[PDB]
Each structure stands twice: as C-alpha cells, then as structure tokens.
Amino acid sequence: GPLGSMPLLETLTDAEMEKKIRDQDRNTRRMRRLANTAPAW
C-alpha cells in the first residue's frame, strides 16, 4: 500500500504519476522562483 525505498516494479496509475510530478513541479517551481540565477543572452 504505502510507499517505500524507491522501488522498480510497483506499477502505478495516472494519479500517482501526476501526484509526484505535480508535487515535484510545485517544489521545484517554488524553489526556482526563490533559488535560480542563470543569466544569458
């Protein structure tokens, strides 16, 4: 049921995938707007 050590045979669904993606997107985006200074052009 719950989660554990980054497995590699626990086929998930669109909810789990979107959950991790959305979570990582909010965390990265949040830390990005407050942690990212890559200039160019």
CSV table of N, CA and C in Angstrom, one decimal:
chain,number,residue,atom,x,y,z
A,1,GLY,N,0.9,-1.2,0.0
A,1,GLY,CA,0.0,0.0,0.0
A,1,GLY,C,0.9,1.2,0.0
A,2,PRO,N,1.3,1.7,1.2
A,2,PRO,CA,2.1,2.9,1.3
A,2,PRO,C,3.3,2.9,0.4
A,3,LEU,N,4.2,3.8,0.6
A,3,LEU,CA,5.4,3.9,-0.3
A,3,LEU,C,6.6,3.4,0.5
A,4,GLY,N,7.7,3.1,-0.2
A,4,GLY,CA,8.9,2.6,0.4
A,4,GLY,C,10.2,3.0,-0.4
A,5,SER,N,11.3,2.3,-0.2
A,5,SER,CA,12.5,2.5,-0.9
A,5,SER,C,12.2,2.6,-2.4
A,6,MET,N,12.6,3.7,-3.0
A,6,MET,CA,12.4,3.8,-4.5
A,6,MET,C,12.4,2.5,-5.2
A,7,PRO,N,11.3,1.9,-5.3
A,7,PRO,CA,11.1,0.6,-5.9
A,7,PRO,C,11.3,0.6,-7.4
A,8,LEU,N,11.0,-0.5,-8.1
A,8,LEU,CA,11.2,-0.5,-9.6
A,8,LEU,C,10.3,-1.6,-10.2
A,9,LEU,N,9.1,-1.8,-9.6
A,9,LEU,CA,8.2,-2.9,-10.1
A,9,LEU,C,6.8,-2.7,-9.4
A,10,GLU,N,6.5,-1.5,-9.0
A,10,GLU,CA,5.2,-1.1,-8.4
A,10,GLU,C,4.4,-0.3,-9.3
A,11,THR,N,4.1,-0.8,-10.5
A,11,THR,CA,3.3,-0.1,-11.5
A,11,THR,C,2.3,0.8,-10.8
A,12,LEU,N,2.2,2.0,-11.1
A,12,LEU,CA,1.3,3.0,-10.5
A,12,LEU,C,0.2,3.4,-11.6
A,13,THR,N,-0.5,4.5,-11.3
A,13,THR,CA,-1.5,5.0,-12.2
A,13,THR,C,-1.3,6.4,-12.5
A,14,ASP,N,-2.3,7.1,-13.1
A,14,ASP,CA,-2.1,8.5,-13.5
A,14,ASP,C,-2.2,9.4,-12.3
A,15,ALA,N,-2.8,8.9,-11.3
A,15,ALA,CA,-2.9,9.7,-10.1
A,15,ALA,C,-1.6,9.8,-9.4
A,16,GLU,N,-0.9,8.7,-9.2
A,16,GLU,CA,0.4,8.6,-8.5
A,16,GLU,C,1.4,9.4,-9.3
A,17,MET,N,1.4,9.2,-10.6
A,17,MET,CA,2.4,9.8,-11.5
A,17,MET,C,2.2,11.3,-11.5
A,18,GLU,N,0.9,11.8,-11.6
A,18,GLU,CA,0.6,13.2,-11.6
A,18,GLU,C,0.8,13.8,-10.2
A,19,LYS,N,0.7,12.9,-9.2
A,19,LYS,CA,0.9,13.4,-7.8
A,19,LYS,C,2.4,13.7,-7.6
A,20,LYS,N,3.3,12.8,-8.0
A,20,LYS,CA,4.7,13.0,-7.8
A,20,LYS,C,5.2,14.2,-8.8
A,21,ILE,N,4.7,14.2,-10.0
A,21,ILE,CA,5.0,15.2,-10.9
A,21,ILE,C,4.6,16.6,-10.5
A,22,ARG,N,3.3,16.7,-10.0
A,22,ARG,CA,2.7,17.9,-9.6
A,22,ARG,C,3.5,18.4,-8.3
A,23,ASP,N,3.8,17.5,-7.4
A,23,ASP,CA,4.5,17.8,-6.2
A,23,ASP,C,5.9,18.3,-6.5
A,24,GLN,N,6.6,17.6,-7.4
A,24,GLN,CA,7.9,17.9,-7.7
A,24,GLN,C,7.9,19.2,-8.5
A,25,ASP,N,6.8,19.5,-9.2
A,25,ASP,CA,6.7,20.7,-10.0
A,25,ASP,C,6.5,21.9,-9.1
A,26,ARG,N,5.7,21.7,-8.1
A,26,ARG,CA,5.4,22.8,-7.1
A,26,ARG,C,6.7,23.1,-6.3
A,27,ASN,N,7.4,22.0,-5.9
A,27,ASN,CA,8.6,22.2,-5.1
A,27,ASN,C,9.7,22.8,-5.9
A,28,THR,N,9.9,22.3,-7.1
A,28,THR,CA,11.0,22.9,-7.9
A,28,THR,C,10.6,24.3,-8.3
A,29,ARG,N,9.4,24.5,-8.8
A,29,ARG,CA,9.0,25.9,-9.2
A,29,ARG,C,9.1,26.8,-8.0
A,30,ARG,N,8.6,26.4,-6.8
A,30,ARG,CA,8.7,27.3,-5.7
A,30,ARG,C,10.2,27.6,-5.3
A,31,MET,N,11.0,26.6,-5.3
A,31,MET,CA,12.4,26.8,-5.0
A,31,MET,C,13.1,27.5,-6.2
A,32,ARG,N,12.5,27.4,-7.4
A,32,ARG,CA,13.1,28.1,-8.5
A,32,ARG,C,12.9,29.6,-8.5
A,33,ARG,N,11.7,30.0,-8.2
A,33,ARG,CA,11.4,31.4,-8.1
A,33,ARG,C,12.2,32.1,-7.0
A,34,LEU,N,12.6,31.3,-6.0
A,34,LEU,CA,13.3,31.7,-4.9
A,34,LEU,C,14.7,31.0,-4.8
A,35,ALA,N,15.2,30.7,-5.9
A,35,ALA,CA,16.5,30.0,-5.9
A,35,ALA,C,16.9,29.6,-7.4
A,36,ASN,N,17.4,30.6,-8.1
A,36,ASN,CA,17.7,30.4,-9.5
A,36,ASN,C,18.2,31.7,-10.2
A,37,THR,N,19.5,31.8,-10.5
A,37,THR,CA,20.0,33.0,-11.1
A,37,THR,C,20.9,32.6,-12.3
A,38,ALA,N,20.4,32.1,-13.3
A,38,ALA,CA,21.1,31.7,-14.5
A,38,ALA,C,20.9,32.6,-15.7
A,39,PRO,N,21.7,33.7,-15.7
A,39,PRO,CA,21.6,34.7,-16.8
A,39,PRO,C,22.1,34.2,-18.2
A,40,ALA,N,21.9,35.0,-19.2
A,40,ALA,CA,22.3,34.6,-20.5
A,40,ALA,C,21.6,35.4,-21.6
A,41,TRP,N,22.3,35.7,-22.7
A,41,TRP,CA,21.7,36.5,-23.8
A,41,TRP,C,21.3,37.8,-23.3
